[PDB]
Write a protein that binds this ligand. Structure first.
Ligand SMILES: Nc1nc2c(ncn2[C@@H]2O[C@H](COP(=O)(O)OP(=O)(O)O)[C@@H](O)[C@H]2O)c(=O)[nH]1
Ligand SMILES: [Mg+2]
Length: 173
């Protein structure tokens, strides 16, 4: 619950296994596309203005990673976070299981006061006949972990991107 110029402001941190699509989520959400160019391991934190209810919110968006120096820097990203997106890829069951084994506990340790939103990324990839994570599985995990919501999204297909960040704003304001 911050106010930075005259605009309500929110800090959102994005966490989850490598390659679940965290950097693409932020690029697609804020830039409206994923550029054909070298995608960085971690996007430096930045502010994005989002027009929502009928007002403007300033979102302070923090990408994170677990490779190279970013693994060591990650804990420092959490301070004063209002919302944490717990991200996995729906076609990667390992990443889903790690929400419970690694990511939710890490968040509870460093920033228990943050609200969490469970985010099922790469939903464009879900298909019958594999062991892809279902919407019911995401809903159940959200329930067990006390997240505010489970939201499915695709950066590539532009599905659910605004919903993720609109729900983030909603649970704070
Ligand atoms: N099909 C599909 N692929 C995606 C999507 N988002 C990301 N990817 C792919 O997943 C790879 C890893 O994404 P990235 O954002 O770098 O993952 P990060 O390590 O969690 O930040 C990228 O090379 C994309 O090719 C998506 O919504 N749909
Ligand atoms: Mg990344």
């Amino acid at each position: 619950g911050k106010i930075e110029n005259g605009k309500k402001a929110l800090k959102i941190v994005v966490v989850g296994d490598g390659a679940v699509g965290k950097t693409c989520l932020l690029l697609a959400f804020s830039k409206g596309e994923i550029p054909t160019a070298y995608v960085p391991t971690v996007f430096e934190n930045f502010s994005h203005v989002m027009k929502y209810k009928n007002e403007e919110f300033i979102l302070h968006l923090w990408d994170t990673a677990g490779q190279e120096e970013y693994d060591r820097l990650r804990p420092l990203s959490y301070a004063d976070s209002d919302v944490v997106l717990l991200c996995f890829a729906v076609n990667n069951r390992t990443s889903f299981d790690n929400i419970s084994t690694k990511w939710e506990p890490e968040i509870k340790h460093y920033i228990d006061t943050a609200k969490t939103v469970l985010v099922g990324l790469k939903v464009d990839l879900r298909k019958d006949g594999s062991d892809d994570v279902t919407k019911q599985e995401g809903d159940d995990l959200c329930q067990k972990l006390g997240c505010v919501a489970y939201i499915e999204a695709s950066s590539v297909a532009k599905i659910g991107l605004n919903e993720v960040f609109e729900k983030s704003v909603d649970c704070i304001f």
